[PDB]
Design an enzyme around this catalytic site. Structure first.
Site, PDB file in Angstrom:
ATOM      1  N   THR A   1      37.277  -7.895  29.851  1.00 58.92           N
ATOM      2  CA  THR A   1      37.352  -8.461  30.609  1.00 58.92           C
ATOM      3  C   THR A   1      39.258  -8.336  30.545  1.00 58.92           C
ATOM      4  O   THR A   1      39.512  -8.505  29.171  1.00 58.92           O
ATOM      5  CB  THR A   1      37.127  -9.828  31.417  1.00 58.92           C
ATOM      6  OG1 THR A   1      37.428 -10.342  32.331  1.00 58.92           O
ATOM      7  CG2 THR A   1      37.088 -10.113  29.860  1.00 58.92           C
TER       8      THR A   1
ATOM      9  N   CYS B   1      48.573  -1.681  29.153  1.00 60.81           N
ATOM     10  CA  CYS B   1      48.964  -2.507  30.098  1.00 60.81           C
ATOM     11  C   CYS B   1      50.089  -3.046  30.690  1.00 60.81           C
ATOM     12  O   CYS B   1      50.904  -3.798  29.933  1.00 60.81           O
ATOM     13  CB  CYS B   1      48.148  -3.629  28.586  1.00 60.81           C
ATOM     14  SG  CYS B   1      47.590  -5.490  29.216  1.00 60.81           S
TER      15      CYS B   1
ATOM     16  N   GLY C   1      42.957  -8.157  21.386  1.00 64.07           N
ATOM     17  CA  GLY C   1      44.469  -7.382  22.271  1.00 64.07           C
ATOM     18  C   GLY C   1      44.476  -7.633  22.990  1.00 64.07           C
ATOM     19  O   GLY C   1      43.550  -6.855  23.567  1.00 64.07           O
ATOM     20  N   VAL C   2      45.491  -8.335  24.171  1.00 64.50           N
ATOM     21  CA  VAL C   2      45.376  -8.018  25.443  1.00 64.50           C
ATOM     22  C   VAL C   2      46.772  -8.469  25.621  1.00 64.50           C
ATOM     23  O   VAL C   2      47.941  -9.339  25.428  1.00 64.50           O
ATOM     24  CB  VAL C   2      45.070  -9.041  26.044  1.00 64.50           C
ATOM     25  CG1 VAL C   2      45.568 -10.523  25.365  1.00 64.50           C
ATOM     26  CG2 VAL C   2      44.990  -9.344  27.833  1.00 64.50           C
ATOM     27  N   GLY C   3      47.787  -6.926  25.950  1.00 61.07           N
ATOM     28  CA  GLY C   3      49.193  -7.011  26.020  1.00 61.07           C
ATOM     29  C   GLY C   3      49.833  -5.740  25.424  1.00 61.07           C
ATOM     30  O   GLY C   3      50.417  -5.053  25.665  1.00 61.07           O
TER      31      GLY C   3
HETATM   32  N1  LIG Z   1      45.937  -5.830  31.290  1.00 58.46           N
HETATM   33  C1  LIG Z   1      45.218  -4.427  31.782  1.00 58.46           C
HETATM   34  N2  LIG Z   1      44.453  -3.647  30.377  1.00 58.46           N
HETATM   35  C2  LIG Z   1      44.581  -2.427  30.636  1.00 58.46           C
HETATM   36  C3  LIG Z   1      44.725  -1.771  31.922  1.00 58.46           C
HETATM   37  N3  LIG Z   1      43.993  -0.614  31.152  1.00 58.46           N
HETATM   38  C4  LIG Z   1      43.436  -0.610  30.084  1.00 58.46           C
HETATM   39  N4  LIG Z   1      43.717  -1.515  29.516  1.00 58.46           N
HETATM   40  C5  LIG Z   1      43.597  -1.855  28.040  1.00 58.46           C
HETATM   41  O1  LIG Z   1      44.115  -1.472  27.668  1.00 58.46           O
HETATM   42  C6  LIG Z   1      43.416  -0.478  26.418  1.00 58.46           C
HETATM   43  C7  LIG Z   1      43.941   1.140  25.854  1.00 58.46           C
HETATM   44  O2  LIG Z   1      45.477   0.722  25.930  1.00 58.46           O
HETATM   45  P1  LIG Z   1      45.694   1.752  24.965  1.00 58.46           P
HETATM   46  O3  LIG Z   1      44.996   1.256  23.872  1.00 58.46           O
HETATM   47  O4  LIG Z   1      46.103   3.724  25.146  1.00 58.46           O
HETATM   48  O5  LIG Z   1      47.168   1.593  24.203  1.00 58.46           O
HETATM   49  C8  LIG Z   1      42.073  -0.816  27.349  1.00 58.46           C
HETATM   50  O6  LIG Z   1      41.155  -0.908  26.364  1.00 58.46           O
HETATM   51  C9  LIG Z   1      42.168  -2.200  27.315  1.00 58.46           C
HETATM   52  O7  LIG Z   1      41.856  -3.162  26.903  1.00 58.46           O
HETATM   53  C10 LIG Z   1      44.937  -2.425  32.758  1.00 58.46           C
HETATM   54  O8  LIG Z   1      45.230  -1.868  33.909  1.00 58.46           O
HETATM   55  N5  LIG Z   1      45.253  -3.796  32.537  1.00 58.46           N
END
Ligand SMILES: Nc1nc2c(ncn2[C@@H]2O[C@H](COP(=O)(O)O)[C@@H](O)[C@H]2O)c(=O)[nH]1
Ligand SMILES: Nc1nc2c(ncn2[C@@H]2O[C@H](COP(=O)(O)O)[C@@H](O)[C@H]2O)c(=O)[nH]1
Ligand SMILES: Nc1nc2c(ncn2[C@@H]2O[C@H](COP(=O)(O)O)[C@@H](O)[C@H]2O)c(=O)[nH]1
Ligand SMILES: Nc1nc2c(ncn2[C@@H]2O[C@H](COP(=O)(O)O)[C@@H](O)[C@H]2O)c(=O)[nH]1
Ligand SMILES: Nc1nc2c(ncn2[C@@H]2O[C@H](COP(=O)(O)O)[C@@H](O)[C@H]2O)c(=O)[nH]1
Ligand SMILES: Nc1nc2c(ncn2[C@@H]2O[C@H](COP(=O)(O)O)[C@@H](O)[C@H]2O)c(=O)[nH]1
Lengths: 467, 467, 467
Positions: free
Chosen positions: A246, A302, A295-297
């Site tokens: 989430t 994101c 990790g959120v952000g």
């Molecule tokens: N808030 C948000 N997080 C996202 C979204 N799509 C992916 N993420 C987060 O970003 C992660 C992937 O980012 P990356 O690791 O490719 O930089 C995902 O596993 C999830 O935690 C989105 O539409 N909104």
């Protein structure tokens, strides 16, 4: 984690703001270190493909599972498709990759578009279960787009039975005009296709398998709706690992979902996220979760950092949450903000039991997307965010909720013109992590965490070295 | 080293993050300071050409040795070529540069391509050991590419015997149409070519020579294989200094190699690297090494920072290692991250007994590479990393090792359209170091280290001044 | 010549202003017509390479002579070079082309520059008269420009003895990685190199040979100076045909030169030019010339049209002069204004006994020039005019004459990226002439002249068809 003397920065650090100081090393070579994870997810490399519909598919699942990393199926997916994907993955050869099977009645356009589904560079034209030809970018080009594939000037292939050691097929492909070779079942039916570099990788990587010796796979559920029923049905569908994802992993709905899944006693390891605070990890661990996503952000897709100002630099959040989880015995998965193998190495160094790649793997041949082409003809793919799939939930109500909902962000992940397959991205990541182990002098990931020393670097410190 | 009051940054500093505060100076001019090194390598300027196959050749070796800096021959090189290069360098005039000798039967294309091997701008057509003509970019242009060089409209040259003081040849070349002048042996045979700016430099720089008065040279060995036998054979080949180089200089293999070479008692100074930690320098010093190379990651061709996250900002590593070595009596060579003469000045200020240039010198006329041209016709050269030559080590095994091996990175080092020779880069570096000495007020390099005061500067602090 | 009814244009016609009307044809295929010339020059194809220093060399001479066309050596050339070229050409195999012989001590740059001297695409590295290797654009690329050719990773070649029919060497090269094959002498020494398309052409074209079975060659003299002595020395040098060329072929100096050469009674056919008038051809024929060059101004390098207004459209001049010469029994060579094979076909149709190509062949691999490259990397070559070499003649006198002399015009003749060799231009020209013969229905060139019917077309008439 250990830091250099006098390094107490007054700000949370990201991956670009930290570096690893090499120590006294006894590890001779990169091959002398094992990347097996301790989290219980049973991945022999510290790589997890994110639960994104643009990065998590059956092809990526089987490939990464064969290479030793688990793949989390995207949430909000029809359980029929989940079961089909799980059955497909569990019925794959532990060594041989499943090729692009082509029926003789397929068109040239379909063959050309399918050729880029896998990194082999060639597709197998199979008749009545018996391989009869091979197609590639050479013979396909020039001929009419809608001519049948039975008239595409099929080439000759190197045929070998299933069970030959990678040595023999490797030397068989030393002078082969086509890099791939067809591994055929003893009855003569086609069982798969193995490549020269695939033969090379068959020994370096140990495939991630469950107790029954089948490629491990994972699936994700949200918090809106009946979490318990969805998780139970997912467990019966054959998913090895359950991930509850989430946007905000510290809310009461997250805790209730984890409590319900833990009370279900499904036996699979528990993954929850995302929390970038020690108290959030403590709450998730006490809620009945064995593994915590952090990790959120920082996620490349994101947007919440720009829209809301919430988030945290990935490295500091990962290290703090890893310290908390190891205090409570739990384990940590870093998520988001991974664009270079140094990010993976630092995430594992900070104390995370695993890292999760995300949109970086979306720019690969095996990602469940459409390989589009730009004006300059450079290959690339579109990566999308999960958006409402990671958010807690008539036409009026639907549109009212969608008005305030964050839009599905889109990014262009360019394909490597030569090393475009996810096999090669995994090779780069694993080579970087092994080199980090050798520089630290660690024989395993727990030793990596124990013996790593990290320093702080300024903006100009990141400019050192070749980009 | 001394720092400004209140300057305790919570991060390792690079060259761009530090500056030198001028102090009370008694040094009148830049020529009043001597750049002789104390490390025992016997280089009269604090410049070492790296052990890179793209930057270390016989021409660069002889040039830098004549200018007072030592050159480390690249590792993993056939000892036959090593012996040929060492014999060539040891048989060079201490004042006169060896020109591009051209046999009369060479083609115009060969002459034109050879003209850029040296910075003189002209090549000598010599017959039977006697100089008979001079060629340049003017007379060569327009004529057929494959016409013989005996029909390239040879120009007239200023001939002077060997032994005339640079004053006389300087005034002889005041109005000469061609800047170069042929220094001929007393019997009439050609001994070399000396230039106007070469005449100028013949007094400013004192050539680095061994006990026998021959241009000093150095060579490098790895750690894979029998280090002792290779080092002993290198010592018998005539190399003045031995450098043992590897990606990680703190591993047990490095210590064993240093122990073996020290037990060999070859008598040459010992150089080992790279370590960016005080404990690594202590281990290397106790292993039997007199000089320690410092810096893994700042190298302009080094990739490990992006792939693994390991490394350290160059300035802080250099100063800490220099403090440790001076505590144990050892001496320090900074390696990597040198792109401006301020980098050299700060490396010497931090406490390093010497600095090592690397890929910056690859963009010179004398670098052992091919002078290619870009679309805009700006001269440049390709610089490559050492890769497996700096790493610790059948077709299957070879390809398996090469799959995980870092690729040989390539960079485009542009030539200065006017001051393209390594002579002028050395002039810039030496002028910068001399000016730093005058600003600090130091008469020598040990006084530079003792009396330097360094402050910390932000990102906007680096923008001050003309780029 | 026959013209369509009502076609009496009030202007001289060029090649673009005329067309051939096909008639009743009995010639089945293009191979059923012979292109042997009647002029006595003994060329089996109606193609002559002009007496231009940028288009007439030893390589072009031998190639075109082997393909059945004569080559006129440029005027004002040292008779030593003339004798060397004639001896080289007369000592060539009637079937096998002389390759780019490479000594093992040649540099990579020399090999790469020499590879484009011939159309074979590969060069032979020969040691002690025995072929030991083959080089091409593939193995040469990437390696250092000044490495020796003995270390350029020589490839394997198909070796066959001299005397094997083109059928056998053709089937030998069906699956050969390198198109060329080395024809070796019975003792084992290299005698030449024959190509796949060379094997094809060995049967279609019959080489032009003299009474002694050696490749025919021609040379040119001016009118300034002693014409008789130069012509006699040229005849003793071994030139089969003598061409006396000047800007204006109707002056008294031209007539005196032809009279002197005819009185010499050398026995070789006489060629004089250029005259674009019937009276000029009559004067040249009566002066003792068997063949008359026609065309002053249409030459692609000729400038006199723009500077002086003199000249004549090529087609009308050619037809009128051909009518006059056939009235007096003489024969005609069209010169200048040839850019498409239709120009050759129309020149032969107008009544000319032969056509002379000129600067079109300068844009070939075998032209005696330097193969330069443009910014877009498209291959091309520089074509120059003869200027004073085709004009009638202290520092003051030299500069005074040069001030009023027409400058040496320069043009950029682009190379065909695939069919760049003069072999392929000859193939195009011969195919066009054969097709013209079939459309007219003529079994030979005299029948082409007799049975051709020509019509007049406007500017928009030339736009018909694919360019
Ligand atoms: N808030 C948000 N997080 C996202 C979204 N799509 C992916 N993420 C987060 O970003 C992660 C992937 O980012 P990356 O690791 O490719 O930089 C995902 O596993 C999830 O935690 C989105 O539409 N909104
Ligand atoms: N004919 C054929 N189509 C394939 C193959 N693999 C994937 N596809 C196509 O790709 C679709 C699924 O894409 P994916 O979700 O695997 O990226 C299938 O429904 C089918 O259209 C194959 O081996 N053969
Ligand atoms: N003819 C000639 N070649 C030279 C000279 N100096 C260098 N070369 C060329 O350069 C090669 C070596 O290049 P380097 O390793 O010195 O950059 C030699 O083998 C030779 O081909 C010279 O004075 N004369
Ligand atoms: N890890 C690594 N270091 C390299 C490589 N090539 C050169 N180096 C390092 O970088 C130095 C040169 O960098 P520079 O001083 O030009 O920035 C060399 O002396 C060596 O220490 C390579 O391929 N890998
Ligand atoms: N080494 C070598 N040079 C050749 C060969 N053919 C032509 N050349 C070069 O080309 C020059 C003459 O050019 P041409 O007048 O034939 O176009 C020769 O003097 C020589 O430099 C060959 O087979 N080997
Ligand atoms: N007036 C004049 N004619 C030239 C010059 N160079 C070549 N030509 C003529 O033009 C002919 C070649 O032209 P092309 O046939 O290539 O159009 C030569 O054979 C010669 O007759 C020049 O400098 N001046």
């Amino acid at each position: 984690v250990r830091f250099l003397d006098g390094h107490t920065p007054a700000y949370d650090l990201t991956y670009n703001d930290v570096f690893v100081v090499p120590g006294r090393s006894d590890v001779a070579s990169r091959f002398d270190v094992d990347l097996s994870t301790v989290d219980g997810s049973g991945t022999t490399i510290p790589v997890v493909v994110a639960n994104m519909t643009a990065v998590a598919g059956r092809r990526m699942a089987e490939t990464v599972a064969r290479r030793g990393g688990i793949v989390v199926l995207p949430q909000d997916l029809p359980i029929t498709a989940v079961s089909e994907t799980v059955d497909f993955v569990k019925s794959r050869d532990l060594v041989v990759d499943t090729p692009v099977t082509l029926s003789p009645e397929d068109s040239v356009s379909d063959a050309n578009a399918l050729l880029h589904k896998r990194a082999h560079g060639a597709a197998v034209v199979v008749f009545e279960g018996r391989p009869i030809g091979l197609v590639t970018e050479a013979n396909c080009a020039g001929v009419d787009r809608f001519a049948r594939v039975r008239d595409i000037a099929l080439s000759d292939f190197v045929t070998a039975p299933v069970g030959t050691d990678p040595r023999e097929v490797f030397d068989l492909l030393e002078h082969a005009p086509i890099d791939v070779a067809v591994m055929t079942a003893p009855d003569g039916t086609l069982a798969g296709v193995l490549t020269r570099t695939g033969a090379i990788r068959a020994g370096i990587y140990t495939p991630a398998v469950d107790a029954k010796g089948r490629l491990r796979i994972a699936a994700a559920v949200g918090i809106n709706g009946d979490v318990g029923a969805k998780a139970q049905a997912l467990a019966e569908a054959g998913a090895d690992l359950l991930v509850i994802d989430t946007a905000h992993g510290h809310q009461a709905k997250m805790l209730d979902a984890i409590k319900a899944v833990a009370s279900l006693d499904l036996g699979l390891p528990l993954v929850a996220g995302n929390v970038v605070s020690a108290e959030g990890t403590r709450d998730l661990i006490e809620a009945g979760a064995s593994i915590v996503k952090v990790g959120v952000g920082p996620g490349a897709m994101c947007t919440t950092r720009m829209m809301t100002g919430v988030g945290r630099p990935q490295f500091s959040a990962v290290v703090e949450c890893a310290a908390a989880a190891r205090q409570l015995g739990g384990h940590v998965w870093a998520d988001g903000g991974v664009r270079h193998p140094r990010d993976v190495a630092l995430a594992l160094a900070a104390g995370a039991s695993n890292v999760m790649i995300g949109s970086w793997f979306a720019g690969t041949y095996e990602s469940p997307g459409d390989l589009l082409f730009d004006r300059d003809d450079r290959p690339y793919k579109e990566s999308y965010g999960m958006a409402s799939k990671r958010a807690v939930a008539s036409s009026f109500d639907r549109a009212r909720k969608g008005l305030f909902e964050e839009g599905i962000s889109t990014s262009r992940m360019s394909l490597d013109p030569a090393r475009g397959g996810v096999e090669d991205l995994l090779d780069h990541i694993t080579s970087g992590v092994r080199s980090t182990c050798t520089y630290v002098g660690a024989a395993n990931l727990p030793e990596l965490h124990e013996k790593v020393v990290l320093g702080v670097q300024s903006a100009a410190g990141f400019a050192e070295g070749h980009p």
